[PDB]
Design a protein around this ligand. Structure first.
Ligand SMILES: [Mg+2]
Ligand SMILES: [Mg+2]
Ligand SMILES: [Mg+2]
Ligand SMILES: [Mg+2]
Ligand SMILES: [Mg+2]
Ligand SMILES: [Mg+2]
Ligand SMILES: [Mg+2]
Ligand SMILES: [Mg+2]
Ligand SMILES: [Mg+2]
Ligand SMILES: [Mg+2]
Ligand SMILES: [Mg+2]
Ligand SMILES: [Mg+2]
Ligand SMILES: [Mg+2]
Ligand SMILES: [Mg+2]
Ligand SMILES: [Mg+2]
Ligand SMILES: [Mg+2]
Ligand SMILES: [Mg+2]
Ligand SMILES: [Mg+2]
Ligand SMILES: [Mg+2]
Ligand SMILES: [Mg+2]
Ligand SMILES: [Mg+2]
Ligand SMILES: [Mg+2]
Ligand SMILES: [Mg+2]
Ligand SMILES: [Mg+2]
Ligand SMILES: [Mg+2]
Ligand SMILES: [Mg+2]
Ligand SMILES: [Mg+2]
Ligand SMILES: [Mg+2]
Ligand SMILES: [Mg+2]
Ligand SMILES: [Mg+2]
Ligand SMILES: [Mg+2]
Ligand SMILES: [Mg+2]
Ligand SMILES: [Mg+2]
Ligand SMILES: [Mg+2]
Ligand SMILES: [Mg+2]
Ligand SMILES: [Mg+2]
Ligand SMILES: [Mg+2]
Ligand SMILES: [Mg+2]
Ligand SMILES: [Mg+2]
Ligand SMILES: [Mg+2]
Ligand SMILES: [Mg+2]
Ligand SMILES: [Mg+2]
Ligand SMILES: [Mg+2]
Ligand SMILES: [Mg+2]
Ligand SMILES: [Mg+2]
Ligand SMILES: [Mg+2]
Ligand SMILES: [Mg+2]
Ligand SMILES: [Mg+2]
Ligand SMILES: [Mg+2]
Ligand SMILES: [Mg+2]
Ligand SMILES: [Mg+2]
Lengths: 93, 274, 47
RNA sequence: AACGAUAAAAGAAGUGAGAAUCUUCUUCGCCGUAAGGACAAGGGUUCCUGGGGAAGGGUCGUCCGCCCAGGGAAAGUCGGGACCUAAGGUGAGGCCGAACGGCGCAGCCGAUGGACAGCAGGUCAAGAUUCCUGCACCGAUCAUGUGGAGUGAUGGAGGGACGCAUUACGCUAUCCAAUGCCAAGCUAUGGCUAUGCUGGUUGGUACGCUCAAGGGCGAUCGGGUCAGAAAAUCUACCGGUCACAUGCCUCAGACGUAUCGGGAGCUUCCUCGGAAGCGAAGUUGGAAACGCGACGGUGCCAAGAAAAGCUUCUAAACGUUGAAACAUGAUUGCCCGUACCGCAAACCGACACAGGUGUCCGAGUGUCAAUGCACUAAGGCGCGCGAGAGAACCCUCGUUAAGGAACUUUGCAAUCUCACCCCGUAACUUCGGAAGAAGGGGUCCCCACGCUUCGCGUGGGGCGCAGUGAAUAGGCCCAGGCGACUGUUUACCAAAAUCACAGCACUCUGCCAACACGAACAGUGGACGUAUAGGGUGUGACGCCUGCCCGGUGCCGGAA
RNA sequence: GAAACGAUGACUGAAUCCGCGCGGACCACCGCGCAAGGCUAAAUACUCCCAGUGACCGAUAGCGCAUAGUACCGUGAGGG
């Protein structure tokens, strides 16, 4: 359902700085429509979104011993809200 | 009659070009230009069939009607005489009081601004479209069809004439540009006059190029080829056949008749072409 | 000098592709024959 | 043997277990229509950060395009799709065929093309017409008002809609000049003490009676059924009518004003050197596009896509107290593509390979011009062995007494010639040419004078061996053979006298044409062509011409 | 072949009970047979898979693999 769509938050110098300007960044399910993501974030956080952007991200191909393989392809979503609305569980961070 | 050229490049002496000064400078009708792609002489299985075709200027088709029975009775006027690339003949535009615009082959002499009338009741003057029987004997005519309403299949290239030898059964005895005598149903339409351009036979190509501009790839002498390639191939020099002159496929050329021996049309040919 | 193999994604897919191979009995016959050999690479679209 | 182009290196300093190879500094050298910059195709994390050093690197590595980890890629407006059609591929029905199958109208797929709303800036260690700032735009849905009767399709018409060469007028990008403007500081080594030197010198938006070349232009009435299946204020005919010079319309760009940026640098703090803050000027003169005004002008023959969106008209329809249309406001904004290499060490070449790879951009000085040549800016690089030696011999070059083809199969090779201006120029000819034939002169600096300027002419003067002072840069002729000519060919030993060629001839072919590909009474090429056309064969510009033999053979014709 | 018999592509085409078809040209006789209408398990074949066995192999042998149709080569089929 809703909660299924949001795999994880993005953790990195970039993303923190973004939330410090009130802009948050989530690892999403690769098939997700932007509207689906928008709605999902709203329900999960009771926050009105004014802007989204997304990006499909090919997973790094790495090797373990003789075994060459690919990590899961992902999708990154960046959202910016109105009203300087924040999200607590990820703001203190 | 023809344009000539001073010899300022070697292949510019012999060269000549047609006289266009009598062609009303017009783009063809938007409602009458069709798209004509080329073919290498390749057919829907992709193989060369017609041999030595390719290149040449891009061409649009200009729809013509030959069977004028659509507009029989009513008459039009000559709007212009334009250039058509895919025909030896110049063509001309028709404006009917009816309101429709049409394209018909443009006969020798027929000037812009003239009016012309199709349908059984029409004078023996240049351009009218008459059934054959209504045509006075010995007349000079072209655009003859072989079946009433099927459309003009005879006398179409520049400067060609059909001269009605005269009536007979249901049919009319007809003289073909080849010198052949044929029987044609008198119900078949026709259009009064010689075909036009006519000086077309005299133009000189001049430079290899010209062939290419007319989409004609160079034509290969068998004698140059190899045994593997063609009957006349091989030998240790310039060689003279070494057998009867023969096509790529082996059937004799030079003299061998080819028209199918048993055929329906035969009892409509009164004299062989000669 | 210019060499034989000159990469083209659309070429390769349209030529050695799965849809391509399935479009004909002989290509179907490749597919089956390959499956049988236990190839990881059934077909070019597997790359 | 070799360490993969002879573009080149030197010192200091740092680091480190270890340094000719890594980092920094100072120089030196090499590319600069490129060896710089930006796309596409392809590749696939190679990008950034931090670490590593077995192997990969033709040495060495502390380094790397290698190994490990973590980060990094953001779109209503760019490209693709939710739009369009081309070749082509498909294709219910339908046409053929032992089978699998081959065709095939409409429809459909199909970009390399049509269509289509966003610009200026800023900044991560790594993204940017995507994010942030600043101000626009587009469709869609709704609300409030202007509503106050039409809306107009799956069919019609208009339109989209197209070539090559050349060229007039105006402008921009952009580059040059200067005792224009602005900012900084200095006096070198004999002089300069600024009139020297260095650097910078306007991008978007809005408005404006300012300027403005160029470019686009019929209106309406009526008639004709028969044309557009039908309809029809639409279209096409026919007829009538409307003050030719033009005005009607547009405004590339310019100027102005305002405003948003940017801007040489200045400052401050500081952590193998970055962070923020601040901000001057905006001139005059000149050059100038393949870009824009533009769907311009002229000339030519080989005669130069389609469909949708768009505009217009009815059919049907539901309406006609809510029909289009407008204005403001709100709302909304899908999918995939964006990192990096991308003339190359990241693509194709088994390699970090002297090869190959499509498009755009591609500054200055000098030079008749230039994308040529030399040097150079920005930018990029010194090509991942090094050091000494200074023999034979080998390669690539410089010069060479006297002679000058005596060499040799052959002047093979190498030299001579070399640009621009003026003078001058043969046989021969198809009167175009041969022709840059041949040959001779000139070329630099100063000064005055004249003229149409960047310049040139004239005169006089000056210096050297020499003045296209270096680089780019024809040796010529006489006479044959072959082919007329431009062209074409054996990827990787032959470029020619081969092929093709315009011209010529023979012949076949009357159109379901001959001819050709075919499982085939399918379909297709020929050709949406029609004997001034089409196939096949030979000859090969042009000129003068093209003889004798029909027994054999082959073709056409004959018939007891 | 003296070529019966079945089998169809083309043309043509009879009797139904004293009738019809065969018996290796063809005739008589003597024998065997009821075409042109349909289904039918069982014994037989094979071995991807499963189990047992072996004067079969034990790491160049045995399957190509002590596992992999992988690495690698090729545009591809395919090889490996
Ligand atoms: Mg995206
Ligand atoms: Mg890795
Ligand atoms: Mg010929
Ligand atoms: Mg030969
Ligand atoms: Mg033969
Ligand atoms: Mg021969
Ligand atoms: Mg050595
Ligand atoms: Mg090297
Ligand atoms: Mg060296
Ligand atoms: Mg130390
Ligand atoms: Mg080095
Ligand atoms: Mg230092
Ligand atoms: Mg480059
Ligand atoms: Mg990618
Ligand atoms: Mg090493
Ligand atoms: Mg260390
Ligand atoms: Mg790196
Ligand atoms: Mg935006
Ligand atoms: Mg098909
Ligand atoms: Mg495209
Ligand atoms: Mg656009
Ligand atoms: Mg688009
Ligand atoms: Mg101009
Ligand atoms: Mg300018
Ligand atoms: Mg000065
Ligand atoms: Mg001094
Ligand atoms: Mg369509
Ligand atoms: Mg990029
Ligand atoms: Mg190689
Ligand atoms: Mg190297
Ligand atoms: Mg290379
Ligand atoms: Mg330039
Ligand atoms: Mg230059
Ligand atoms: Mg150069
Ligand atoms: Mg530099
Ligand atoms: Mg580089
Ligand atoms: Mg000498
Ligand atoms: Mg000498
Ligand atoms: Mg001699
Ligand atoms: Mg030589
Ligand atoms: Mg002369
Ligand atoms: Mg000379
Ligand atoms: Mg002297
Ligand atoms: Mg001199
Ligand atoms: Mg030279
Ligand atoms: Mg030649
Ligand atoms: Mg040549
Ligand atoms: Mg060769
Ligand atoms: Mg050669
Ligand atoms: Mg029988
Ligand atoms: Mg062992």
């Amino acid at each position: 359902s809703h909660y299924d769509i949001l795999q994880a938050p993005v953790i990195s110098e970039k993303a923190y700085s973004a939330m410090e300007r009130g802009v948050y960044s989530f690892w999403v399910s690769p098939k997700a429509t932007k509207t689906e993501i928008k709605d999902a974030i709203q329900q999960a956080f009771g926050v009105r979104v004014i802007g989204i952007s997304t990006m499909n991200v090919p997973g790094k191909r790495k090797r373990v011993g003789r075994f060459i393989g690919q990590r899961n392809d992902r999708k990154k979503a960046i959202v910016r809200l109105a009203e300087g609305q924040s999200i607590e569980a990820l703001a203190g961070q | 009659a023809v344009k000539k050229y001073k010899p300022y490049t070697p292949s510019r002496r012999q060269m000549t070009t047609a006289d266009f000064s009598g062609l009303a400078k017009k783009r063809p009708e938007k409602a009458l230009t069709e798209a004509l792609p080329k073919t290498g002489g390749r057919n829907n299985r992709g193989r060369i069939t017609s041999r030595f075709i390719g290149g040449g200027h891009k061409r649009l088709y200009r729809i013509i009607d030959f069977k004028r029975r659509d507009k029989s009775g009513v008459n039009a006027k000559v709007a212009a005489i334009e250039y058509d690339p895919n025909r030896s003949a110049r063509i001309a535009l028709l404006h009917y009081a009816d309101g429709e615009k049409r394209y018909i082959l443009a006969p020798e002499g027929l000037t812009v601004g003239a009016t012309v009338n199709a349908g059984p009741e029409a004078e023996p003057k240049l351009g009218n479209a008459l059934p054959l029987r209504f045509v006075p004997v010995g007349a000079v005519v072209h655009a003859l069809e072989l079946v009433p309403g099927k459309g003009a299949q005879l006398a179409r290239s520049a400067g060609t004439s059909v001269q009605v030898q005269g009536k007979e059964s249901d049919y009319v005895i007809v003289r073909l540009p080849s010198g052949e005598l044929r029987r044609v149903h008198s119900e078949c339409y026709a259009t009064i006059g010689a075909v036009g351009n006519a000086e077309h036979k005299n133009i000189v190509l001049g430079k290899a190029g010209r062939s290419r501009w007319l989409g004609r790839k160079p034509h290969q002498r068998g004698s140059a080829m190899n045994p593997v390639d063609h009957p006349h191939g091989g030998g240790e020099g310039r060689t003279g056949a070494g057998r009867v002159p023969v096509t790529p496929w082996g059937k004799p050329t030079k003299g061998l008749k080819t028209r199918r021996k048993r055929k329906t049309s035969d009892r409509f040919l009164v004299t062989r072409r000669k | 000098m210019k060499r034989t193999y000159q990469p083209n994604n659309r070429k390769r897919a349209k030529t050695h592709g799965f849809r391509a191979r399935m479009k004909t009995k002989s290509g179907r016959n490749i597919l089956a024959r390959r499956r049988a050999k236990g190839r990881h690479q059934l077909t070019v679209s597997d790359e």
